[PDB]
Amino acid sequence: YLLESTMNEYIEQRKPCDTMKVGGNLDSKGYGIATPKGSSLGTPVNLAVL
Amino acid sequence: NSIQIGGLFPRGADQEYSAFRVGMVQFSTSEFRLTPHIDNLEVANSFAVTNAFCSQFSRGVYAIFGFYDKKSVNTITSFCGTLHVSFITPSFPTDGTHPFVIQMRPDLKGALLSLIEYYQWDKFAYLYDSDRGLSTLQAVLDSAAEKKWQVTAINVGNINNDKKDETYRSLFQDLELKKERRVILDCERDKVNDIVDQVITIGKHVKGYHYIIANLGFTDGDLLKIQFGGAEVSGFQIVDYDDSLVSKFIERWSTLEEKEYPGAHTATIKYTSALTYDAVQVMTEAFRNLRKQRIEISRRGNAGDCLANPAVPWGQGVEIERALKQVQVEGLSGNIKFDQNGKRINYTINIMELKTNGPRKIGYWSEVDKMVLTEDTVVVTTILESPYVMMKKNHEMLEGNERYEGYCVDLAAEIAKHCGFKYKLTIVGDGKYGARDADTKIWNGMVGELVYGKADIAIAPLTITLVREEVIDFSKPFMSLGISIMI
Amino acid sequence: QVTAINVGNINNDKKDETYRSLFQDLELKKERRVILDCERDKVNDIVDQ
Amino acid sequence: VITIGKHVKGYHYIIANLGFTDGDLLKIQFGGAEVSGFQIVDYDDSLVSK
C-alpha cells in the first residue's frame, strides 16, 4: 500500500510494529494550507508559515 | 413661590459654582423660584462647616446643597440626622445608611472590581489617596483574599510639594524591585496629573505597563501626555458626550463667557461639576412634585438656632426627603434612580480605554449586570488523521475546541494566533481527501468545503498539485515528503 | 504577604456563620499567623469564636 | 522622544554639539537610556568658576 511518507513513518513507530517503510521517497509533494484564491488570510499566513 | 435653600461651596471650586448657576437659569420655571444664598468656605475645616451650617439653619432653609470632604463628612451626617435637614451632594458616598443625605455621585467599587477580572490580573499595585475615604481600598482588600490577588497598596497622599520628585522615584524604584507592571491609580484630578507627570519623567509608560485611573473622570485630566506612550490606560466615565442631551449641554457650555462663568468655555466638563448641574434638576423636580401632591410645608415659624436644648426637629422635613428619594429623571450621567438610603441605583458607567486616536468606549457597567463589553472568523475544514488531528479520550469530558489535538492542531493554533484569527475546526467526515473528479469535476472532501466557499482556512496534510493550485491559493509546504511503500 | 480583612461590620445576628466563614477561607489557604487590631469587646468576641 | 516613550533602557543618544548641559536635560535624566555628549566649558575650572 503506497502512501504518504511521514504517515507511513508514524505507523512504524506506533506499536503494532508490523509495518515497514521500505526503499525511500518516490516523489516530492508539499503540505500547504489551503486558502481561498486571493485569500483574506493567505499573505499573513505565508510569512507566518515561514 | 420663592423656595429658599442654602449653598456651601469650597474656596476655589470655580467650575462647580458656574455649573450651579447654569441649572439655576435653565431649570428655573415660571411657577416657582429657588433662592440659592450661597456661602464660601474651606471644606476641610469642620469648625468652618459647622458655623456655616448653623448660619443657614438660623436663616431657615428647606434643603442644602454643598460639598463635604473626608475631614468633615461626619459633621454633616450627624447634623442632617439631628435637625432633619436634607442634604444633596456630589461628593464621595458615605458608607452606611444615612438619612437625609442625597449622594449624587454613583458608587464605583463594583465597576472597579469587575474590570480587574476582565483583564485577568493576579498581581498589581494600588496607589491610593486618603482624601476620599478608604472605602475603595477596603473593598479591594476584602476582594483580594477570596480571589487570590497580591495587592501592594501604597498610600501617596501624605507628600509635601517640596519633596514630591524625590519620593515618587523612591516610590516606583520599589515597584521595579517587585517588577510591578500593573497599577491602579485611585485619586482625584490633581494627584493623577502629578503622578502621570512623574510616571513620564522616569519613563514608566512604555508598552508592558497598564494603568487604571479609578475615578469618574477619565477624560477629565490631561491625557495627551500618555496617549502615545505604549502602556494601555483604562478608566471610568459617567458623562458620555455621544448622548444628545449631553451634546445639547456642551454646545451651550462651550459658548459661555469666561468672566461671567469661569471655566465654562471649554470642550469638556468635569464629572464633579456635571453632577452639580444634575442636582439642580433634582432639586427643582422635588418642588414640582411637592405642590403637585399639595403638601404645603411652609414652616414660616422661626427655625431658631442649631444649639437648642433639647434640639427639636420639624416634621415637614420628613416630607421633603421622601420627595427627594422618589425622583427618577434624566440628566448628564443618565438614569438618576435613588434608594431609601440616598445612594444611586440603576445607573451606567462607561468603561473607557485609551487608544492612540483617543478615548474609546469598550462598554458600560450596571448593577443588574456587570461590565457589558459593548464592542463595535475563520472556519477550519480538515480531517482527523494521526498524529495530525486526533479525537481525545476526553471527548464528552473536555468540551470546547481542545476536543481535538495533534500535530496539525498545534500548527493550526500557531497559524491562527500569529496571524490574529481564532480557529474553528469542523471535520467533514466523508473521508475523501478530494480532487477534481472525472466527468463531473466536483471537489469532494476538504476542497469541497474550501473551493465552494463553505470554509475559509484549511490546515490539513493536503497536497499542492497543479490542478489544486489553479482553483485556490496555497501556503508554503509544511514538510518535504514523498510516496512511500508500506508492507 | 498581608491578608487584611475587615471584621468591623459584623453584626450580632450572623456571627457564627461569618466568623466561621473567614477562618475556613484562611484554612483554605492555611494561614497560620493572625494579628488582631480590635477593642476588647471585639477581641473576646473573636477568641470565643 | 519622551512623548512616544523612546528613552527607556535599551536606547542611546549622542547630542552632537558643544553644549551638552546647555539644553534642558532633567527630562531625560531618569529615563534609562544612556545619553552622551560634548562640552567645552568645564565648570570645574577655577577661571570658569570665577
Side-chain angles (χ1 to χ4, degrees):
Chain A
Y1 174 71
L2 279 76
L3 76 165
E4 307 290 327
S5 293
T6 180
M7 290 185 183
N8 196 359
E9 193 271 332
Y10 179 74
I11 311 299
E12 187 176 1
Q13 295 296 321
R14 180 63 184 272
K15 64 280 292 180
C17 291
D18 55 353
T19 66
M20 184 175 177
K21 180 172 183 179
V22 296
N25 288 316
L26 264 293
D27 202 0
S28 180
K29 293 175 171 65
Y31 283 168
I33 297 168
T35 60
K37 186 68 177 176
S39 178
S40 297
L41 55 92
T43 306
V45 160
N46 283 315
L47 195 276
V49 166
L50 291 175
Chain B
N1 207 168
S2 66
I3 295 97
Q4 190 177 4
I5 55 97
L8 275 74
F9 279 167
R11 183 178 62 84
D14 297 334
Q15 185 175 358
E16 297 88 1
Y17 178 67
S18 293
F20 182 69
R21 289 182 293 174
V22 173
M24 293 300 287
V25 176
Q26 176 177 358
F27 293 104
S28 178
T29 184
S30 299
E31 56 188 1
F32 62 93
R33 184 67 180 173
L34 295 175
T35 301
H37 184 68
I38 304 165
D39 295 333
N40 192 3
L41 50 94
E42 296 87 4
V43 75
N45 207 165
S46 296
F47 178 78
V49 181
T50 304
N51 54 2
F53 183 80
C54 291
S55 296
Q56 294 182 357
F57 190 77
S58 68
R59 302 296 181 92
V61 293
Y62 289 158
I64 286 173
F65 183 79
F67 293 174
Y68 54 81
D69 200 357
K70 181 61 175 67
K71 287 174 93 288
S72 67
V73 57
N74 288 318
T75 306
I76 294 300
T77 61
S78 179
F79 284 171
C80 296
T82 298
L83 296 178
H84 291 73
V85 174
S86 296
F87 191 78
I88 302 98
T89 176
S91 297
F92 60 98
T94 67
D95 289 332
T97 61
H98 295 80
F100 295 93
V101 173
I102 297 300
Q103 289 90 11
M104 294 300 294
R105 182 176 295 174
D107 194 1
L108 184 61
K109 298 179 263 75
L112 178 59
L113 285 171
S114 296
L115 188 64
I116 299 168
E117 306 97 9
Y118 182 76
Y119 290 98
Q120 295 179 357
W121 285 0
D122 52 355
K123 180 176 76 173
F124 61 94
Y126 182 78
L127 299 175
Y128 64 97
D129 193 359
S130 300
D131 293 333
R132 294 178 293 112
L134 279 305
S135 297
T136 313
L137 178 60
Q138 291 173 356
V140 302
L141 287 176
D142 289 333
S143 179
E146 67 184 4
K147 287 193 282 186
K148 193 180 180 292
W149 289 341
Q150 293 177 357
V151 174
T152 307
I154 296 170
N155 195 358
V156 80
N158 49 8
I159 289 172
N160 296 321
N161 295 116
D162 54 354
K163 57 180 74 174
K164 287 189 288 186
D165 298 331
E166 293 176 352
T167 50
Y168 288 108
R169 269 73 156 181
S170 299
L171 178 61
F172 287 100
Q173 282 181 354
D174 181 76
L175 293 175
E176 179 62 32
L177 298 176
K178 189 56 68 178
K179 295 188 290 182
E180 287 294 329
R181 297 283 177 266
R182 298 164 173 90
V183 167
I184 296 173
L185 294 176
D186 194 2
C187 294
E188 63 272 18
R189 289 186 60 191
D190 301 335
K191 295 297 290 181
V192 167
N193 286 321
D194 286 330
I195 287 169
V196 170
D197 283 332
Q198 296 295 322
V199 169
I200 290 167
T201 302
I202 66 169
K204 200 165 257 71
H205 64 90
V206 292
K207 193 260 188 294
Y209 289 135
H210 196 284
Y211 290 87
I212 297 169
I213 300 171
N215 50 3
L216 296 178
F218 174 67
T219 60
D220 194 6
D222 193 359
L223 198 61
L224 302 174
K225 58 178 72 175
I226 54 169
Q227 183 174 357
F228 301 93
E232 299 176 354
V233 174
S234 301
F236 291 141
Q237 183 169 357
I238 59 171
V239 180
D240 196 1
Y241 298 102
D242 293 331
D243 188 75
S244 64
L245 179 59
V246 177
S247 299
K248 292 176 73 68
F249 186 78
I250 292 297
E251 186 177 359
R252 288 184 61 190
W253 181 253
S254 63
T255 52
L256 297 176
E257 177 63 29
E258 287 291 325
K259 63 177 70 176
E260 180 64 30
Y261 297 107
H265 175 71
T266 56
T268 62
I269 188 165
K270 64 187 292 182
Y271 71 97
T272 302
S273 298
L275 299 174
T276 307
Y277 178 74
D278 287 331
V280 182
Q281 177 175 358
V282 180
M283 289 178 68
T284 305
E285 183 70 30
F287 295 98
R288 296 181 70 250
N289 198 5
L290 182 56
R291 300 177 297 110
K292 186 184 288 184
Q293 299 302 111
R294 291 189 297 273
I295 303 169
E296 291 86 5
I297 47 93
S298 296
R299 46 105 61 224
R300 64 179 175 89
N302 296 114
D305 56 352
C306 63
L307 297 175
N309 207 166
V312 57
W314 52 277
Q316 294 86 19
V318 188
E319 301 290 328
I320 297 172
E321 63 174 357
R322 294 186 295 173
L324 288 172
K325 296 172 190 290
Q326 294 295 323
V327 164
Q328 181 173 1
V329 299
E330 292 293 326
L332 299 177
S333 179
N335 206 168
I336 300 173
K337 184 183 286 186
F338 288 161
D339 202 3
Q340 302 91 21
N341 299 319
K343 295 182 183 294
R344 293 182 61 185
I345 54 173
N346 199 1
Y347 56 82
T348 59
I349 291 171
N350 305 316
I351 295 98
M352 294 181 75
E353 197 274 333
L354 183 64
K355 289 282 101 177
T356 58
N357 291 315
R360 293 179 67 247
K361 178 180 178 182
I362 65 170
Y364 63 98
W365 189 80
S366 70
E367 308 85 1
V368 184
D369 290 331
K370 292 182 286 295
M371 177 185 174
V372 179
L373 49 100
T374 306
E375 64 181 1
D376 294 333
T377 59
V378 297
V379 174
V380 182
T381 182
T382 180
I383 196 166
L384 66 160
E385 293 295 326
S386 65
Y388 298 100
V389 179
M390 293 179 284
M391 180 176 175
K392 193 175 284 186
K393 78 283 188 186
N394 296 318
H395 175 71
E396 292 291 325
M397 183 178 288
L398 196 277
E399 296 294 326
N401 56 2
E402 204 183 5
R403 65 181 66 189
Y404 292 106
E405 71 275 16
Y407 172 73
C408 179
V409 178
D410 286 335
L411 186 58
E414 288 292 329
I415 203 66
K417 294 300 296 297
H418 285 283
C419 294
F421 292 104
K422 79 283 289 179
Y423 59 90
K424 194 263 185 182
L425 269 73
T426 299
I427 290 170
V428 174
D430 54 354
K432 300 178 291 296
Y433 285 93
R436 194 175 70 187
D437 285 330
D439 186 72
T440 314
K441 292 180 176 65
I442 302 300
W443 299 97
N444 304 116
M446 296 179 288
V447 289
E449 298 286 324
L450 203 280
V451 177
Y452 292 92
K454 288 185 261 73
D456 197 2
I457 192 170
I459 307 100
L462 197 150
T463 296
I464 304 168
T465 321
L466 187 143
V467 299
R468 300 285 179 86
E469 182 68 28
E470 179 66 29
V471 289
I472 43 93
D473 192 74
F474 284 102
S475 70
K476 274 77 181 175
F478 289 161
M479 63 187 75
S480 297
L481 56 100
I483 300 172
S484 173
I485 304 100
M486 182 171 175
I487 61 171
Chain C
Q1 294 183 358
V2 173
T3 302
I5 294 168
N6 192 2
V7 76
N9 286 317
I10 308 303
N11 289 317
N12 301 115
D13 56 352
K14 58 183 179 292
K15 293 186 285 188
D16 295 334
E17 67 180 3
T18 312
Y19 285 99
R20 192 174 66 248
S21 178
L22 84 162
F23 275 102
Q24 58 86 25
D25 186 77
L26 295 175
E27 194 65 29
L28 263 65
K29 199 261 181 295
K30 278 94 178 67
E31 280 286 327
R32 293 287 185 265
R33 295 166 172 89
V34 175
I35 299 171
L36 295 173
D37 190 359
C38 296
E39 295 179 354
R40 63 177 296 275
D41 297 329
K42 188 61 67 69
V43 168
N44 289 321
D45 195 4
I46 289 170
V47 174
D48 289 334
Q49 295 293 323
Chain D
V1 169
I2 290 167
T3 302
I4 67 169
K6 200 165 257 71
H7 64 90
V8 291
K9 193 260 188 294
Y11 289 135
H12 196 284
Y13 290 87
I14 297 169
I15 300 171
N17 50 3
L18 296 178
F20 174 67
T21 60
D22 194 6
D24 193 359
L25 198 62
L26 302 174
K27 58 178 72 175
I28 54 169
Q29 183 174 357
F30 301 93
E34 299 176 354
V35 174
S36 300
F38 291 141
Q39 183 169 357
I40 59 171
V41 180
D42 196 1
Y43 298 102
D44 293 331
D45 188 75
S46 64
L47 179 59
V48 177
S49 299
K50 292 176 73 68

